[PDB]
């Protein structure tokens, strides 16, 4: 069953049909199991892409709205704010869908250092995507849950993952993004990002080839953000 679902989710990945990929992997995640690293990544990517598209839309619609507030053409802006709110709903529903899956299945049935960090990270990322388009008590509520989830993943990452581990750098990358984008805190963003870079570098001497590829990949992403941000 799971074997069939996972190969259907790979086919979906390749066709770039991530609405079906989400279906496949949610059926797996329903079985209340410890996911293999492949199942974890397939799940993450499938949801990342589906939310991804909506976020890119929301950005572009928000741009047209802000470029029509300034120009002062107000009568066309009636349609846009319903079309933004539509996308905001799709976002809220996707984020809520995965969080319900994380809260009810994955985190409850995750007895393993990696998966635990991975899922608390995922939880933080989606609270963050909720924080992205939210405003008022909403944005504060989501930002609190995003943070709490990243600190809860960080705590566990620092005790059970070495600094080289890509899932810990990933968490460190997205946490730095949280600080920069959500709390509007460029210093803590740069300080957190670099701090993760500068731990992995040391113990790096001693990794299997395919791990160095992983660790280095995420360190490029950390180094680029610091590069872009400064």
């Amino acid at each position: 069953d799971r074997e069939d679902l996972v190969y259907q989710a790979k086919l979906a990945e390749q066709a770039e049909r991530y609405d079906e990929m989400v279906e496949s992997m949610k059926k797996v995640a329903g079985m209340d199991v410890e996911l293999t690293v492949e199942e974890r990544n397939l799940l993450s990517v499938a949801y990342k892409n589906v939310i991804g598209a909506r976020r890119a839309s929301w950005r572009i619609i928000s741009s047209i709205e802000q470029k029509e507030e300034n120009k002062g053409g107000e009568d066309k802006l009636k349609m846009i704010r319903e079309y933004r709110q539509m996308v905001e709903t799709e976002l809220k529903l996707i984020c809520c869908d995965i969080l319900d899956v994380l809260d009810k299945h994955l985190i409850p049935a995750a007895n393993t250092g990696e998966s635990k960090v991975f899922y608390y990270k995922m939880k933080g990322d989606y609270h963050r995507y909720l924080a992205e388009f939210a405003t008022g008590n909403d944005r504060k509520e989501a930002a609190e849950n995003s943070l709490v989830a990243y600190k809860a993943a960080s705590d566990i990452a620092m005790t059970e993952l070495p600094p080289t581990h890509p899932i810990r750098l990933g968490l460190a990358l997205n946490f730095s993004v949280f600080y920069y984008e959500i709390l509007n805190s460029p210093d803590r963003a740069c300080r957190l990002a670099k701090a993760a870079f500068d731990d992995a570098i040391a113990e790096l001497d001693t990794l299997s080839e395919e791990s160095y590829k992983d660790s280095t990949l995420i360190m490029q992403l950390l180094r680029d953000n610091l590069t872009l941000w400064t």
């Binding site: 990933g170 990358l173 993004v177 920069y180 984008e181 995420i218 992403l221 680029d224 953000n225 872009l228």
Partner: peptide
């Protein structure tokens, strides 16, 4: 360029 997130 868009800042990287993973």
């Amino acid at each position: 360029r868009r800042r990287n997130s993973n």
